[PDB]
């Protein structure tokens, strides 16, 4: 954890609570504009303080390192701790620092991604049907522990499709779907 | 030319090479097969 | 400047700074730690018992660029590389 | 009797034992009993003993000779032997471990990651055995590869293999899966009888018949089988019968691997492809009587060739007239499978009985297809079927409208023919492979026929004459005038011959306006193959093929036409009338060289005395070549002043005709013959000194002359001299042999991406596909035929226009893809369904459909195919903006009809084109790899220096994206706009060590002390662009850490304003002289800071943009790192970061990885390729199409067949299939060619049946 | 450079006894070579049917040929009588079923059967299928 | 020439000169080491 | 919502191009060829002295072709396609046809 990262992860942190707001909602950049962020930084126990600007809802998580982690519930806690881990594992609440050595969630080659309701998966499921019996199409893959898997993340929704909103140069935008597979 | 290679005559240069006309190409043949018939005849006699 | 090293990790050097430049590619022609000096000098200033210890940081930045800049108004020099000026080639390649 | 599964599997012992043909000699009597006897099968003039059949009917049977006690090793799977050695204890024979013993874990109720962790365990064991039965060590068996037997590292020691047989053979069934055993370990040893193969694969060989060199292996074998030896001689004699190449290293002997050595293998050389039996190759040549569905035949090969007639109700009697006429050259007989060849008066005519379903064979007619082709084939364009038309001579005669898409000429080309007769074969060739159907190109969709050479200067001509009388007119015309109209007019104008052969009223922004050419003059872009305004292009999209090609062939009989009438010629007073110009250019370069070089002096001999300091190499380099180019320059604009002159004085110059007309002739080409030559370059550099400092000794020791170093003055008219020849040559030859090299590699690229693309094609729903994975929702975008949809302007949201909310809120949901390349590219162009602009006609504001009708008729169209084509899935809200834009009631007005039609053509469009089965992967690699093979060898692409990290342009870019090699060094690039976060990393990473400042070291002893002194000036620290402390620095920073210095003590002096003295006091360890000439010697290149690269690491700027009218300005850096964890401490907040595939898919993810190699594969190949983005997005499509990247030079995710691994060229994938026990189905292209089946590809995606009701309710 | 030295034509001829194909040699009347280039631009047109039998063995060289579909082994004829020995020594009772392939590739495959490769190949047996009258549709815009 | 719709123009690249068909195939210790 | 999805893609089956008129033509034509019996109307010695291509066209467009294609799980006639692209297609094949002297 030092004091450059946090900045970065502040910025994860409030996709976070998008998510967190309205399991449905698009994730990008821009979301960004709706928030604002406050930073106290130390060696043991970092807070951040995200904030919903016409809601004026705080939301206050506290990042540890791995190693040490001293977790009290405080005022409006996200529930759960931060964790900053040294290699990449599976859970939504721990991030490796190779996640943050830049400012990840500002380059032009973050995604813009959704979450699929269940009209829009029946659709896609009947979509995938060959018209031959049963015999269906597979989406590609997609591994489990990526970042956009961990900012998708609610506890009572497991998360089989994810959409994407491709830049495309001579279309504007263009739409994919990808499946999620777990890794042990 | 450790320390000035570029100044130094490369190995691909015409400076440092000879070329073989018709008469070398007998001539080293010659020098071969005498020498392998001088051989032979060494070995012969040893053996014998 | 913060510690940014290398390792055997193409080039093309003058030949007479490539030697230096990969011996020094070499971990095992450092010590493990460093070495004080240990030959006495710039016996005018005390501001040097003031870097040499405890200042371990970007103050002792700060006192060595104050060290730099003193040395150079003692001689009488501007002290400010941005200061001074380079000298213009176009007026020897303008032509045409 | 459809072959639809093949399953992979090792014989069992006893499937050996069981023949009745026992081999037991070297030699007999009758051969009877050895490795040669007839009962294995027929040979040269003898049936076979066993079924009695000759060789055309016999395929072999098996034999066995028998081997005693003699265990023996199957040579491709000895590796696997020892795989199998390292799980076990040799010893006992048990596992290495001791949990898989134990009754309270059940391994049938877990797999995967149970299984992998419990013999990850198994293996990392390697202990002393566990077990107490022997408590033994373990041990490492390897093949010996000098003995042919299995020796141990420890001790030298011989292993047998009756020992690993025993021990291999007691592991339980119920602990296979851990060791990953599928069948058997007993099936890997021959143990009673070693089989003898049949004689179909080793026939006697011919040119008295040699022996086969398989025979000879096997009859070796069998020579120390009988004479009870031991097993190292039987195993080295199997070895080298089987794979020689197991123990030895040569690789010319002959044995059972031979089939699949290398490239050579068999499935490559005779089952994907072969010789056939009706086939010819002749040089080509033109025919002005031949159009372009046509191609002529020579005599001699009319009279060979042999064309199918079918018995059947409706031609008996024909054939029977044939017979009578001495006609029909061959018969066959169906219902005795007999083929006769039917003399002339030599043969009998009752022999003959003309069954149904018979046929006769006679000599070739015209109008028959036939298949014919150029080689090299790069596209589809290169293999079509024409109709046969009798010519003259012996070379097969081609239209000049076909060349371009062949690639062919006539300086002594050649083509080859085939004929297939198959009924089938016939109506596919008549209707897929006729030329008429292959106008549009796949990708871009211009036409791939049309004019060449002097055609053009013609048309640009025929355009622009005047005063044509009626009489002038209809002889230009020839067999066309027929329905030319004269309608009141006595004097008619070249425009007026355009109109008429433009029979059609349509409008197109540019070039046409009531089917009226409207631009100034006709040029290659409108009669050339493959350009962007071509006519015939037009006229296709207007109504179809058919008139596209009419107007081909039309406009080319006029234009030659008009060249039989006029003539055109170039001649020698038409480039050099006379010597003033030349004179006067030449005076000019005379002057200003020596200008230059004056100049050079003048600095050389300021720096030699001391009034400046000298440059840097690298900007004196930089200061010369700026002058030379500004002369350059000037030659340009002295060629480009005196075209326009003469143009001026002499309108009629045919040289200037072929400048304007577009063909071949520019002001750079005039200025080599007629200016000056200009810089020669060797990798975007001159050329290098040898020997004194110089290239030739023409010139002095070190000389500086330009003139020396590859500057050519003079033109080809006024004669090149010896050296400026000699830097010509350097420059052609080099070109001729990188042209090789690049022949050499595109090849196998090009193979590479064809064989892994080749089964990808669109579904029964428009879809993108491959095996049984979903691609792409939409085909094209827009489920529409590639050909057909149109590039358009894109229009930018304003204030002006009629629906501006609406159009505004659509740019806002799709913009986002449109500023690319890292903010410094805005969209020029969107993808139209259609082509839409030849339907459009403004109307006169009355008698034009209301605005709020035409909105209601869009949106809803739209809507309607949303939700019935794309399925509720796919966004088109471009195909609404192009359309909103468009037809924009402030920009035209339009009557309800255009409105109707226009959308009609649109759910034609969307209904007839696009259909299931379409090879759109094939194609599209065929495209790539034509673009990347032709840009090589004609040197497209120049070589440039460059002072910052660059991602280069070519082949071998394109190479290294695909191959997708890991650790290696990325070049990131860092954007922001706050300069200094970049100035810290500049300063950091940037590399600098002393003797790149021109040090002035010098050394001095006294007592107890060495007293070196280090002088720099200033100039070049501020050009560094570093401090004084810097250097500073990195001194004490490499003297405190050194290991040869032992005390030291440093101090720092101001010489004067423009120097600075750095002192060491030093005093060095022992031994003393030898560590001092060596520190001495590395001070200048070890006191340095920053990451060693051959790239400095400047800072640029450049305008960047938010949107299409909000604009920025950006400061950029580039640097190469193995990663991203230097940067880590650095407060790279708010800086945009791009770096490369593995960073960013280990970061961000598969999707972005897929960007990424989208658009760096779409750059490699230059400016002007934008077309070739939809075929470069399906290839990065493929290559991430599982979660990870995947390169193309391995099947590694993908579920490829056996036997699609085999012709890829594996080598070894049979036997890992063998070993796995594998079970396929066969689907692929190279699976259903192994099998003579139909692909699924085209008209064989679907399935076919015949109905018989009807035929069943006749009655007779 | 003279054209009457590069002409070549065939129409039928001799074939290479290993594989069975046409010979080589301009002055040996063999045969233009179809190589995999052109392969890949017929199967670029859509024309499955004409690369199907420009690949396959020519149509008058047809002939009965049976595979046991127990062991792959090309069953032998004695007396009349298909019958695969190997099975049949085994005292099994495998079908015999006919095969329409190229020769080169039972050669490839009794090569593979050397090295100890064993290959085998099942058949599609799906059940009959019977058509139904299907209604209409227009698939026409309403204008 | 002139330009119309130069921000869709196609540029050819096409060889002038290709290379014609193939015709019918039809110890004295006295060399380096040279390692 | 999987029914009308199915009833969109069940609707979409029925558009046709070039590729499968082109496999009808091809299967009917090698029957033809090889000795089968037409289908046409008022078949009689008359029918065996035109041409064989003029016999598969009359057989299409009078709704007695044998042929039967698979394309999505479903069976159809050469006459349960779109109309109006059967049409279209055809008169392309046709005008080509008579370019080549077949028809
Ligand atoms: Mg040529
Ligand atoms: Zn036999
Ligand atoms: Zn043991
Ligand atoms: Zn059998």
Redesign the interface.
């Given at each position: 954890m030092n004091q450059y990262n946090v900045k970065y992860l502040a910025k994860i942190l409030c996709l976070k609570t998008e998510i967190a707001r309205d399991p449905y909602a698009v994730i990008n950049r821009n979301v960004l504009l709706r928030y604002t962020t406050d930073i106290e930084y130390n060696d043991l126990v970092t807070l951040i303080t995200v904030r919903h600007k016409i809601d004026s809802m705080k939301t206050v998580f506290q990042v540890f390192n791995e190693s040490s982690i001293n977790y009290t519930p405080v005022d409006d806690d996200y529930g759960e701790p931060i964790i900053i881990t040294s290699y990449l594992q599976k859970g939504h609440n721990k991030f490796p620092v190779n996640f943050l050595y830049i400012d990840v969630v500002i380059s032009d080659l973050f995604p813009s991604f959704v979450r699929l309701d269940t009209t829009e998966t029946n659709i896609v499921n009947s979509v995938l049907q060959t018209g031959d019996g049963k015999k269906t199409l597979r989406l590609p893959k997609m591994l489990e522990t990526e970042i956009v898997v961990k900012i998708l993340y609610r506890p009572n929704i497991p998360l089989k499709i994810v959409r994407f909103f491709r830049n495309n140069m001579v279309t504007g935008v263009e739409i994919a779907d990808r499946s999620v597979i777990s890794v042990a | 030319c450790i320390?000035?290679?570029?100044?130094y005559?490369?190995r691909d240069?015409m400076?440092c090479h000879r070329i073989l006309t018709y008469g070398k190409y007998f001539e080293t043949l010659a020098?071969?097969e005498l020498?392998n018939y001088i051989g032979n005849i060494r070995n012969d006699i040893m053996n014998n | 400047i913060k510690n940014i090293g290398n390792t055997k990790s193409e080039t093309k050097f003058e030949?007479?700074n490539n030697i230096g430049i990969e011996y020094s590619k070499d971990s095992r022609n450092k010590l493990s730690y460093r070495n004080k000096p240990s030959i006495a000098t710039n016996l005018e200033y005390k501001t040097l018992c003031d870097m040499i210890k405890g200042t371990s940081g970007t103050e002792k930045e700060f006192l060595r660029y104050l060290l730099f800049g003193i040395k150079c108004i003692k001689k009488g020099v501007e002290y400010n590389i941005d200061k001074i000026k380079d000298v213009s080639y176009n007026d020897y390649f303008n032509v045409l | 009797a459809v072959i639809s599964k093949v399953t992979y599997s090792l014989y069992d012992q006893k499937e050996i034992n069981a023949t009745d043909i026992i081999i037991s000699h070297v030699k007999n009597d009758d051969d009877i009993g050895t490795v040669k006897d007839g009962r294995l099968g027929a040979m040269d003039g003898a049936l076979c003993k066993t079924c009695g059949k000759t060789e055309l009917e016999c395929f072999g049977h098996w034999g066995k000779v028998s081997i005693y006690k003699t265990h023996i090793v199957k040579p491709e799977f000895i590796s696997e032997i020892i795989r199998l050695l390292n799980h076990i204890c040799i010893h006992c024979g048990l596992l290495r471990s001791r949990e898989p013993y134990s009754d309270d874990i059940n391994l049938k109720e877990l797999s995967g990651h149970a299984l992998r962790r419990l013999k990850d365990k198994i293996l990392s064991k390697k202990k002393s055995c566990w077990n107490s039965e022997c408590m033994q060590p373990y041990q490492k068996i390897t093949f010996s590869k000098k003995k042919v037997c299995f020796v141990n590292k420890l001790d030298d020691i011989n292993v047998p293999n009756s020992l690993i047989y025993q021990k291999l053979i007691s592991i339980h069934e119920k602990f296979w899966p851990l060791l990953e055993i599928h069948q058997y370990p007993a099936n890997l040893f021959y143990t009673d009888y070693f089989p003898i193969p049949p004689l179909i694969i080793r026939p006697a060989i011919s040119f008295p018949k040699e022996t086969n060199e398989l025979t000879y292996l096997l009859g070796m074998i069998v020579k120390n089988c009988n004479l009870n030896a031991d097993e190292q001689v039987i195993q080295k004699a199997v070895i080298e019968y089987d794979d020689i190449k197991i123990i030895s290293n040569n690789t010319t002997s002959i044995n059972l691997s031979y089939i699949t050595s290398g490239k050579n293998n068999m499935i490559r050389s005779y089952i994907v492809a072969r010789r056939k039996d009706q086939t010819a190759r002749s040089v080509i040549g033109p025919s002005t009587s031949i159009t372009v569905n046509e191609v002529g035949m020579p005599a001699y090969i009319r009279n060979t060739l042999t064309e199918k007639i079918f018995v059947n109700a409706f031609t008996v009697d024909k054939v029977k007239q044939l017979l009578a006429s001495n006609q029909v050259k061959f018969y066959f007989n169906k219902r005795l499978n007999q083929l006769t060849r039917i003399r002339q008066g030599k043969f009998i005519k009752n022999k003959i009985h003309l069954l149904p379903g018979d046929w006769v064979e006679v000599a070739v007619q015209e109008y028959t297809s036939i298949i014919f082709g150029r080689q090299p084939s790069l596209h589809r364009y290169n293999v079509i079927a024409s109709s046969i038309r009798a010519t003259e001579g012996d070379t097969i005669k081609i239209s000049p409208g076909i060349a371009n898409s062949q690639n062919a000429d006539f300086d002594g080309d050649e083509e080859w023919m085939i004929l297939e007769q198959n009924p089938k074969a016939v109506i596919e060739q008549s209707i897929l492979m006729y030329p008429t159907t292959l106008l549009k190109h796949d990708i871009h969709g211009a036409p791939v026929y049309g004019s060449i050479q002097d055609e053009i200067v013609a048309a640009y001509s025929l355009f622009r004459i005047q005063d044509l009388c009626l009489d002038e007119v209809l002889n230009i015309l020839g067999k066309y005038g027929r329905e030319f109209d004269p309608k009141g007019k006595c004097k008619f104008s070249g425009k007026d011959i355009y109109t008429y052969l433009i029979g059609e009223k349509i409008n197109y922004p540019g070039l046409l306006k009531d089917g009226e050419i409207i631009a100034n003059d006709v040029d290659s872009n409108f009669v050339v193959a493959m350009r962007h305004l071509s006519l015939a292009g037009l006229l296709s999209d207007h109504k179809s093929n058919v008139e596209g090609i009419n107007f081909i062939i039309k406009s080319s009989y006029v234009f030659k036409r008009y060249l039989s009438i006029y003539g055109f010629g170039v001649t020698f007073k038409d480039l050099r009338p006379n010597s003033t110009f030349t004179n006067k250019l030449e005076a000019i370069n005379v002057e200003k060289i020596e200008l230059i070089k004056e100049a050079y002096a003048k600095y050389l001999n300021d720096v030699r005395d001391g009034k400046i300091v000298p440059l840097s190499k690298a900007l004196e380099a930089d200061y010369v070549e700026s002058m030379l180019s500004n002369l350059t320059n000037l030659n340009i604009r002295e060629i480009e002043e005196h075209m326009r002159q003469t143009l001026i004085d002499d309108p009629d110059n045919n040289l200037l005709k072929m400048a304007k007309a577009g063909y071949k002739v520019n002001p750079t080409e005039l200025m080599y013959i007629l200016g000056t030559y200009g810089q020669q370059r060797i990798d975007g550099e001159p050329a290098?000194?040898?020997?004194?400092?110089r290239v030739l000794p023409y010139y002095l020791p070190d000389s500086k002359d330009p003139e020396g170093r590859g500057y050519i003055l003079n033109s080809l008219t006024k004669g090149l001299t010896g050296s400026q020849y000699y830097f010509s040559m350097l420059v052609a030859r080099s070109q001729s042999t990188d042209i090789v090299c690049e022949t050499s590699r595109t090849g196998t690229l090009a193979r590479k991406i064809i064989k892994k693309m080749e089964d990808m094609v669109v579904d029964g729903y428009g879809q993108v596909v491959i095996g049984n994975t979903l691609i792409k929702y939409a085909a094209n975008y827009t489920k529409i035929l590639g050909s057909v949809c149109k590039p358009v302007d894109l229009i930018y949201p304003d204030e002006s226009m009629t629906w501006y909310l609406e159009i505004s809120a659509l740019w806002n949901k799709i913009k986002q893809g449109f500023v690319y390349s890292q903010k410094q590219k805005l969209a020029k162009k969107t993808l139209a369904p259609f082509n839409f602009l030849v339907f459009v006609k403004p109307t006169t504001e009355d008698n034009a459909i209301k605005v709020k009708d035409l909105y209601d008729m869009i949106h809803n169209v739209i809507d309607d195919v949303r939700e019935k084509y794309f399925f509720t899935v796919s966004n088109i809200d471009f195909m609404e903006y192009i359309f909103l834009t468009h037809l924009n009631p402030s920009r035209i007005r339009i009557t309800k009809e255009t409105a109707i039609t226009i959308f009609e053509k649109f759910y034609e469009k969307l209904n007839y084109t696009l259909g299931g089965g379409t090879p759109i992967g094939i194609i599209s690699a065929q495209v790539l790899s034509e673009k990347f093979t032709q840009q090589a060898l004609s040197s497209f692409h120049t070589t440039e220096k460059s002072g910052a990290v660059k991602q280069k342009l070519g082949f071998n870019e394109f190479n290294n994206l695909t191959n997708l090699s890991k650790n290696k060094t990325e070049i990131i690039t860092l954007v922001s706009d706050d300069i200094s976060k970049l100035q810290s990393v500049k300063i950091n990473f940037e590399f600098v060590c002393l003797g790149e400042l021109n040090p002035n070291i010098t050394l001095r002893k006294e007592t107890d002390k060495y007293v070196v002194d280090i002088i720099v000036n200033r100039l070049y620290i501020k050009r560094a662009e570093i401090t004084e402390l810097v250097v500073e620095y990195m001194i004490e920073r490499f003297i405190s850490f050194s290991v040869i210095v032992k005390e030291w003590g440093m101090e720092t002096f101001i010489e004067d304003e423009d120097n600075i003295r750095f002192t060491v006091y030093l005093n060095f360890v022992e031994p003393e002289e030898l560590n001092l000439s060596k520190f001495m010697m590395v001070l200048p290149g070890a006191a340095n800071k920053g990451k060693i690269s051959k790239f400095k690491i400047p800072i640029s700027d450049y305008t960047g943009y938010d949107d299409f009218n909000q604009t920025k300005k950006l400061n950029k850096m580039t640097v190469e790192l193995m990663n991203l964890k230097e940067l880590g401490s650095f407060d790279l907040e708010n800086v945009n970061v791009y770096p490369g595939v593995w960073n960013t898919y280990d970061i961000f993810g598969i999707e972005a990885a897929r960007e990424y190699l989208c658009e760096a594969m779409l750059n490699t190949y230059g400016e002007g390729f934008d077309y070739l983005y939809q075929p470069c997005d399906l290839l990065a499509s493929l290559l991430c199409a599982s979660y990870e990247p995947e390169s193309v030079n391995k099947f590694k995710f993908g579920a490829a067949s056996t036997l699609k691994r085999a012709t890829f060229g594996d080598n070894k994938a049979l036997l890992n299939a063998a070993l796995h026990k594998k079970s396929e189905p066969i689907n692929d292209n190279s699976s259903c060619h192994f099998f003579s089946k139909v692909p699924n590809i085209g008209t064989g995606y679907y399935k076919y049946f015949i109905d018989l009701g009807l035929l069943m309710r006749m009655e007779r | 450079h003279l054209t009457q030295d590069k002409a070549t034509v065939r129409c039928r001829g001799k074939k290479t006894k290993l594989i069975r194909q046409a010979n080589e040699g301009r002055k040996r009347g063999g045969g233009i070579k179809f190589g995999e280039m052109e392969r890949d631009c017929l199967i670029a047109h859509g024309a499955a049917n004409t690369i199907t039998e420009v690949l396959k063995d020519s149509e008058e060289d047809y002939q009965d040929v049976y595979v046991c579909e127990n062991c792959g082994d090309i069953a032998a004829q004695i007396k009349g009588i298909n019958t695969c020995l190997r099975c049949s020594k085994l005292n099994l009772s495998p079908l015999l079923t006919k095969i329409d392939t190229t020769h080169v590739s039972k050669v490839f495959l009794t090569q593979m059967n050397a090295r100890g490769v064993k290959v085998k190949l099942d058949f599609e047996r799906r059940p009959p299928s019977f058509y139904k009258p299907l209604d209409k549709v227009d698939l026409k815009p309403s204008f | 020439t002139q330009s119309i719709h130069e921000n869709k123009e196609i540029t050819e690249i096409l060889p002038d000169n290709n290379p014609s068909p193939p015709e019918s195939p039809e110890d004295?210790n006295d060399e380096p080491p040279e390692d | 919502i999987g029914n009308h999805i199915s009833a969109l893609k069940r609707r979409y089956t029925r558009r046709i191009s070039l590729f499968e008129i082109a496999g009808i033509i091809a299967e009917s034509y090698n029957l033809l060829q090889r000795g089968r019996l037409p289908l046409v109307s008022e078949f009689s010695d008359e029918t065996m002295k035109q041409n064989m291509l003029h016999v598969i066209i009359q057989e299409i467009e009078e709704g007695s072709c044998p042929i039967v294609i698979e394309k999505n799980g479903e069976l159809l006639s050469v006459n349960d396609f779109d109309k109006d692209g059967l049409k279209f297609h055809l008169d392309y094949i046709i005008k080509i046809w008579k370019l080549q002297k077949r028809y």
């Open positions: - | 320390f000035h290679t570029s100044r005559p490369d240069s400076v020098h071969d020498e | 030949s007479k | 290098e000194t040898r020997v004194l400092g | - | 004295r | -």
